[PDB]
Amino acid sequence: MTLPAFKAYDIRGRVPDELNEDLARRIGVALAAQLDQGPVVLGHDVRLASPALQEALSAGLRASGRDVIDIGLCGTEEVYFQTDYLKAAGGVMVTASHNPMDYNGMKLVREQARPISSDTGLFAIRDTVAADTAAPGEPTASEQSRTDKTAYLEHLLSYVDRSTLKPLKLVVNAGNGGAGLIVDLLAPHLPFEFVRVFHEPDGNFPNGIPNPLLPENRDATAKAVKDNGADFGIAWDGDFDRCFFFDHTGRFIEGYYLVGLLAQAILAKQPGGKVVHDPRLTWNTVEQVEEAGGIPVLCKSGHAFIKEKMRSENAVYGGEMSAHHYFREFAYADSGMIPWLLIAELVSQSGRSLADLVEARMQKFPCSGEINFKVADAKASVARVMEHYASLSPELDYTDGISADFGQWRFNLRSSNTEPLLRLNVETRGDAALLETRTQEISNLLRG
Ligand SMILES: [Mg+2]
C-alpha cells in the first residue's frame, strides 16, 4: 500500500498516525530533491500541531542544504505570494484548511507558486518519503524569520481605488481561523466599519471548525449581517483561501454567481482580458464575461488545471463556483482577500447592493447548487442518467466528467476519484420549475 495522506493535490491526514513530525521532516528532505535552486518559504495555520510540523519540515529542508524563509502564522495565499515575490525555489503551507481538529496537512508549490500535485512531483515525493530509512542529517542551511506582511498588504490594496471606497459596514467571520489578522492589518487603510465574528485565531475551534458551508456556521454570519444592518458579510475557511458572501438580507450567495461578478469587476480594470472558468456551471459566466468585453475560457475544475490554463492564456482572472478565485497578478494564485476587496469596491462605486448585483443573474440562470451522491456504483449510476436522456440528444462535452446541454437546461456530472461520490450541478435558462423537476429526476436516477 501507500501513505494515505498523499492526495491528488496536497497532503492531509490525521495526526499522528497519517501525518507526524517524522513524516514532515522526510517530506522536507524529499522536497529539496525536487526543486530548482533557491530557498523555500514555510508558513502555517492556526491548528495546534501546525508549528511543530513546520519545524520538522524546516529541519529536513535545512538538512538538505536549503535556506528556509519562515513567514510564520499566515494564510495559504501568503505562502503563494511570498514564494513568488521572494523568487523562492518553492514553498509549503502547513494547513488542514477546514478539516477536523485531529487533522493537518501541507500544500506544496515550486517556483512562481506553481502547484506540486500527484502527477507533477507530489507522488515522487511520497515514494521518496516512503522509502526513506536514512538517518536524519544535520542542518547545513539557515532559517530566516520573515513575518513582514507589508508587500502582501500593498498588493491586496492595489486591486482597488481607495478614494472610491465608501464606509460600508461589513460583517467579517474568520471562524477562529487566520483571516481576522489580515482584516485587522488592512483596516487602517480602508474606510469600512467591520463587525467581527469569531475573530480571534483559536486552533481549538470553540465555535466549530472553520467551514462556512455548514448551515450552523452560515447562520452566525447571516445573523450578524441582519442584526447590525451590514451592507454584506464575508466568511472564510481556516486558511482563508476561500471566501463566502452574504448579502444585506443575510442570504448566502451561491459561489457560481461570484465568478461572473468578479470577472466583470476585473475586466473593468483589464479590458479585453481572458477569464478562465470551470465546466460545472457556465452559462451565466460566459454571458457576463462577454458582456464586459472579456473572452471566457472553459477549463476542467481544480486549481492545478485552472492555474495552468490561466498561464497558457495570459488570463487575467479565473473563477470556480466552489469559492476559488485566481488572479494573474497574484502569481496566478487564489486569494480569499482580493475577492471581497473587489466586491466592496463594486458596491461602493455602483451604489447597488450586493443582493441587487446578483439578483437578476440568479433569476436568469437559476442553479441547483452542487449536490453530492454516495452511490454503490458511480459508473453504473452515470450510465443510468445518460441512457434516460439519450432520446433528447443533448450536446455532450467531456472536459470535466459529463456536461449535457439540452437547450433550455444543462447539467454537469462529475465523479470523485477517491470515494464513490458523484457531484451534480444543474442550471436552466430562467426556469425554476424546470430546474427542480430535472434535478429531482436526475437525483432519482442516480439513487437507483
Ligand atoms: Mg482552504
Residue numbers in the entry: 1 to 448
Quote the original article.
The α-D-phosphohexomutases are ubiquitous enzymes found in all kingdoms of life. Among other reactions, these enzymes catalyze the reversible conversion of 1-phospho to 6-phosphohexoses, with various sugars including glucose, mannose, glucosamine, and N-acetylglucosamine. In bacteria, the enzymes phosphoglucomutase (PGM) and phosphomannomutase/phosphoglucomutase (PMM/PGM) are involved in the biosynthesis of exopolysaccharides that contribute to the pathogenicity of infections in higher organisms, including humans, animals, and plants. The reaction mechanism of the α-D-phosphohexomutases is conserved, and entails two phosphoryl transfers [Fig. 1(a)], with the initial transfer occurring from a phosphoserine residue of the enzyme to a monophosphorylated sugar to form a bisphosphorylated intermediate (e.g., glucose 1,6-bisphosphate or G16P).
The structure of apo-XcPGM was determined with both the phosphorylated (EP; active) and unphosphorylated (EdeP; inactive) states of the catalytic serine. XcPGM purifies as a mixture of P and deP enzyme, but initial data sets collected from crystals grown at 18 °C showed that the catalytic serine, Ser97, was unphosphorylated. Overall, the structures of EP and EdeP are very similar, with a Cα root-mean-square deviation (RMSD) between polypeptide backbones of 0.26 Å. A small shift in the backbone between these two structures is evident in loop (i) and several other regions near the site of phosphorylation [Fig. 3(a)]. In EdeP, the sidechain hydroxyl of the serine acts as a ligand for the Mg2+ ion, along with three sidechain oxygens from the aspartates in loop (ii). A structural shift of loop (i) between EP and EdeP has not been observed in other enzymes in the superfamily, although only a few have been crystallized in both states. In PC1, a distinct separation is seen between the two apo structures (triangles) and the ligand complexes (circles). This variation is the most significant in the data set, consistent with the obvious conformational change of loop (iv) upon ligand binding.
